[model samples]
Target chain A: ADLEDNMETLNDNLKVIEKADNAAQVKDALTKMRAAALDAQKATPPKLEDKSPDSPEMKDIRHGYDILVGQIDDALKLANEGKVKEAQAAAEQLKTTRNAYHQKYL
Target chain B: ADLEDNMETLNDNLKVIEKADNAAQVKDALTKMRAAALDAQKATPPKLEDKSPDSPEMKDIRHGYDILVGQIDDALKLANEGKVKEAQAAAEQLKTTRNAYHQKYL
Candidate 1:
C-alpha cells in the first residue's frame, strides 16, 4: 500500500484503539500499527547507511517504529496495572508521534 | 438514554474494543463498558435479596457486568504474556455474553 493507504489503515486502527475494551483488542490493533509502520518504512527506501540497512530515511522510519512500539508497551503496562486514566494520558498523544513520519514523507 | 440507545453505545464501544491497540485504549473502553453495564443494572431494577439492592433484574445485570469484567481480566493477562491470539480469542465472544443481557431485558 502507498503511504496514504498506510495512514488510512493506521488511522482506522487508532480509532479502534481509542475505544478498545480488552488487551486482545488492543494487541490486535497494535499488530496492525506494526504492519503499517513497516509498510511505511519499506515505502521509504533508506539509502545505504554507514553500517546498518540502506536508506537515508531509515533512521527516521526506525525512530517512528520505536516510538510506536514503545507506546504500545507503555499502554500495555498501564493496562496491566489497571490505571486507565494515566494510561489514557499516555496514549492520547500517539498521533503527534506517528504522524510526524507521514508529514515528513507522505 | 433508552435501552436501545444504551445498546447502541455498548455496541459502538464493542466495535472499538475489537480493534484496540493499547492497554489505555482497552482500559478506557472497558470503563465505558462498565458504565454501560451499570446503567443496564439501574434500568433493570432487580428485586431485593435477603438484604441487597431492590429489583427483580439486578441479578442478571450484575451477571453481565461480571462477565465483562472477567473477560477483560483474562484478556489483560494474556496481553501481559504477549499472547495476542489467545487474548483475542478470549475477547472475541464478548457479545455472546453481553448480548444475553440485552436480549433478556431490551
Candidate 2:
C-alpha cells in the first residue's frame, strides 16, 4: 500500500511534468518525481515479498528505479539549462523504461 | 479518504487535459474529470461533517462541484467539435473555480 501511494505520487508528478508550461515548472515536477521514485526504491516490492531486500530480485527492482532516476536527472539537467523542449523530450525517455520495468517487477 | 482519492483523480485528469495535444485526448480527460467530480459531489465533505446532506453547507459544496461539472462539460463540448485549443482554454477556466471552492469547503 505504501508503494502504491508512492507510485501514485510519482505518476501524478509525471502528469505535472507533461502539463508544465515552463522550464521551472518542469524542473520542479521532475524533482518531486525523483523524490517519489527514491521513496519507491526504499520500499519492498510486493511481487518480491518472499525475497530478501538484498536478494537478486530486490536488486533488480532497485535497478529499475535507478534507470528512472537517471532519466529524471537527465530531464532535470536539461530543464535547469532552460532547454524546456529538450527537457520534455528527455523526460519522454522514461515511458519505455517504466513500462518494461513495470512488466518485469510491478 | 474516498473524497480525497476522487479529488486526486480529478486533478490528475485535469493535468491530462492540460497536456493533451488533440481534441480526442482533451475530450477523454474532460470526461474522466467530470466523472471524478461527480463522484466527489456524492461524497460527504469532511469540513461539513456535522451537516445533513441537504444542509446549506452541503448544498454549497455541491454547487461548487456543479460549477466545475459545467466547466468540464464546456471543455468537452469544445473538444468534441475538434476545437482543441479552444477546449484547452476552456479547461483553464477551472483553476480559479477550483481554488475558491477548495478554500470554502476543503
Candidate 3:
C-alpha cells in the first residue's frame, strides 16, 4: 500500500513536469518524485522475505522500479536546467519502465 | 455554465500553484488561470436582461464573481513570480469571494 501511494505520487509529479515551464516547477516535481522514491525504498526490500534474488517476478519488478526511479531523477535534473526535451525523454523512459514492470508484476 | 466551468478551472490552477516549486510549474498554473479568466470574461455579461443593476441577488452575485475572478488572476501572477505569501493571500481572497457569490446565487 505504501509503495502504491509512492507510485501514485510519482505519477502525479510526472504530469506536473509535462506542463512545467520554469525551474521552480521542475524542482517541485523533482522533490515530490524523490520523496516518493524514498518512500518506496523504505517500504520494502528488493526481495520478498522468502523469495530468492533470482525469482522471476521479484527480480523483474525490482529491476524495473530501479530503472524507473533513475529515469525520474534524470528527468528532474534536466527539467531543473530547463532542458525540456531531455526531461521529456527521461519521462518517457520512466513510463516505459513502469509499464514493463506493471505488465510483469501487476 | 461556462462561467462555472471557468471558475472550476481557476480553482484547480490554485491547487497546482500551492504545490509548485519551479518557474515552469508556476507558468503552467498561470496559463490555466488566465485561460479560465478569459473564458469567464467571454461569457454572459455583468447585467441580467430582466433584472435591475441594483437587484439584491443579481448585484451581489455579479459583484462577488468579479471579485473572485480578480483575486484568482492576482494569485496566478503572484505564484508565477514565486511570491508564495502573496499568492496564498490572493487565493484566500478568491475563496472568500467565491463563497460569498455561491451563498448568494448558487
Candidate 4:
C-alpha cells in the first residue's frame, strides 16, 4: 500500500514537471516525487517479507529506486541551475532506468 | 469543481510537506500544491461570478490564493540550495499567510 501510494506520487510529479515555470516550481516538482521514492525505498512490502532478495520484483525495486531518486534530484538540480540541456539528459537517464523497473515490477 | 479539486491538491501538499527530508522533497511537495493553487488562481468560481467581487467570501478566495502561491514559491526556493534555516523562515511566513487564508476561506 505504501509503495503503491509512493508510485502514484512519483507519477504525478513527473507529469506535473512539464508545468514547471521557474526554479522553485521545477525544484518542488522534483522534490515530492523523490520523497515518494524515498519512502518506497525504505520499505519491504509485507507480502515480500518472506521473499528472497534474489527475486526479480524485489530486486528491481531495490535497485531501480536507489538510482531513480538520485537521477531525479540531479535532473532538477541541473534545471534549477539553469542547465535545461543537462536536466533533460538526466531525465532521460531516469526514464531509461525507470522503464526497466516498470516492466520488471509494476 | 475545479477549484475544489485544486484546494484538495493544495491541502494534500501542505500536509505532506512536513515529511520532506531534503530540498527536492520540500520543493516537490510544495509544487503540486501550488499547481493546484495556480489552477485556482486562473479561475473565478462560477458561483461567485454573480456575486460582487467586494463580497467577503469571493474576495477571500481571490485574494487568498494569490499571495499563498508566491509564499510557497519563495519557501521552497530557499530550501533548494541547502538553505534549510532560511527555508523554514520562509515556511513560517507561508504558514502565517496560509492561516489567514485558512480562516478567511477553506
Candidate 5:
C-alpha cells in the first residue's frame, strides 16, 4: 500500500491498541503499527514529491517514521512485560508524534 | 448521508470508542455512532431494495439498527458513570452485533 493506506492501517491498529483488554492484544497491535510505519517510511508524501529524497522535507518525513517506530517499540516493551496501563501510556504518546508529523509532512 | 456512508461513519466512531482512554471519549464516540445508526436505520439495503418497507428483510435490517442503537446506549451509560473499562467491555460487544448484521443484510 501507499502512504495514505499505510497510515490508515496504522490508525486502525492504534484503535485496536486503545480498546485492547490484554497485553497480547497491545503487543500485536503495536507490531502491526510498526510494520505500517516501516512501509510508510518508504513512500514519499505527495507534498514532498517535488523535493529530492535527501531534501530537508524528505528527511523530516523519514525522521518522523523513525520516531514512530521507536515509540511503537517502547510501547511494545511495556506490552511484552504485560503492563497494560503503562504500555497504554507509552502508546498514547504516539498520537502526539503522529499529529506532529501529519502537520509537517501530510 | 446514505446507508453505506452512515455505516462507514459508525465504524469510524467504533474505532474511536475502542481507542478511547477515558469516559468522555467513549461517551462522545458512542453518541456519534448512535446518530449514524439512526440515519442508517432508514436506509434499505440493496438486497432488500425491492422489498416493501414492512417486509421481513426490511424489518430485519431496521431491527439491526435498533439493536446497534441499544448497544451504543448501554455503552454510553457505562461511560456516563465514568466506568471506562466497563464501557469498553460493552462497546466491545458491538463488533459481534456489527458482523452478524453485516453478514445478514450488507
Candidate 6:
C-alpha cells in the first residue's frame, strides 16, 4: 500500500511537472519524485534470498523485480529530461512488469 | 534493421501526436502507430519454442521477449489515450527489457 501511494504521488508530480512552463520547475519536481521513487524501492526491496531456487515462481519474481528496477531507472531519466511522452511510456512498461511480478509472486 | 526502422517510425509518429493541437489528429496518429507496432510484433515474433531449457541464454531471451511485448502493449494503450507521460514510461521499460534480451541472446 505504501509503495502504491508513492507511485501515485510520483505520477501526480509528473503530471504537474509536465505542464510546467520553465525547465527549472520541471527539473526540481522530477528530481524530488525520482528520489522519492528510489527511496520507496529501497524500502520495498525484493527478498530474493527467501525464494527457493527450485521454484519457478521464485525465479520469475526475482527476475521481474530486477527488470522493474531497470525500467524505473529509464523512466527516471526521461522524466528528468521533461520528456513527458517518453516517461509515460516507461510508466506503462513498469505497470506491465508490476503485473507480471504480482502474478508470479504476490 | 527493419524492426528498428519500424520502431523509429512509431516513435516519430508518437512525437507528432504528442505535439498535436487537436484531439482528432492525436487519436488518428496513435491508432495508426499502434496498428503498425502490432504488425511489426507479428512479423518478428520471438522463436521461443526452439529454445532449450538447458541453455540459460535461451531462457533469458525467451522471457525477455515475452516481457518486452507485454510492456509494448501497455505502452500502446497509454499512447492511444494521449497519456504521453505514461506511454513514454512504458517505452523506457521496453528499452530495459530489450537490453536484457540483447545481453542474454545477442
Per-residue CA lDDT of model 3 for B5-104, tens digit only, reads 8878878877876776665676577667756765675455444446665654454454444445445555555665777767665666656656755564
Write candidate 2's Cα lDDT for A1-43 as tens digits.
Answer: 3789988988887888888889999988888888888898999
Error of 3 at B44 (Å): 69
DockQ of model 1, rounded to 2 decimals:
0.01
TM-score of 2: 0.49
- For model 2, report DockQ: 0.01
TM-score per model over all chains: 0.38, 0.49, 0.42, 0.43, 0.49, 0.33
lDDT, candidate 1, B1-106, per-residue tens: 7555666776887677678776455556555665675575455332333425533355435545655655555555555565655655666677777666557654
lDDT of 6 by residue, B37-81 (tens): 555544333444465543333334434544554555566667567
Residue-by-residue lDDT tens digits, candidate 6, A3-23: 667667666766765566654
Best by DockQ: 6
What TM-score would you give candidate 5 relative to the actual structure? 0.49
**Chain A TM per candidate, in order of listing:** 0.62, 0.93, 0.74, 0.76, 0.96, 0.50
Instruction: Show model 4 residue runs off by greater than 4 Å.
Output: A45-49, A53-57, B1-106
DockQ per model, Cα? 0.01, 0.01, 0.01, 0.01, 0.01, 0.04
lDDT of 1 by residue, A1-83 (tens): 88778778878887776787665666566667757766765564323224344232454454455556556556656756766
Candidate 3 similarity to native, TM-score: 0.42
Q: What is the DockQ of candidate 3?
A: 0.01
Model 3, A18-96: lDDT tens digits are 7876667766887788678757754444345576544433433444555455566667777778887677667767777
Q: How many clashes does the backbone of model 2 have?
A: 0
Distance (Å) between predicted and true CA of B2, model 5?
A: 65
| The candidate that achieves the highest TM-score relative to the unseen native structure | 5
Task: Using TM-score, rank the candidates from best to worst.
Answer: 5, 2, 4, 3, 1, 6
Candidate 2: give the clashing pairs.
Answer: none
Q: Is the docking of candidate 1 incorrect, acceptable, medium or high quality?
A: incorrect
Better of 3 and 4 by lDDT: 4
Interface RMSD of 3: 23.0
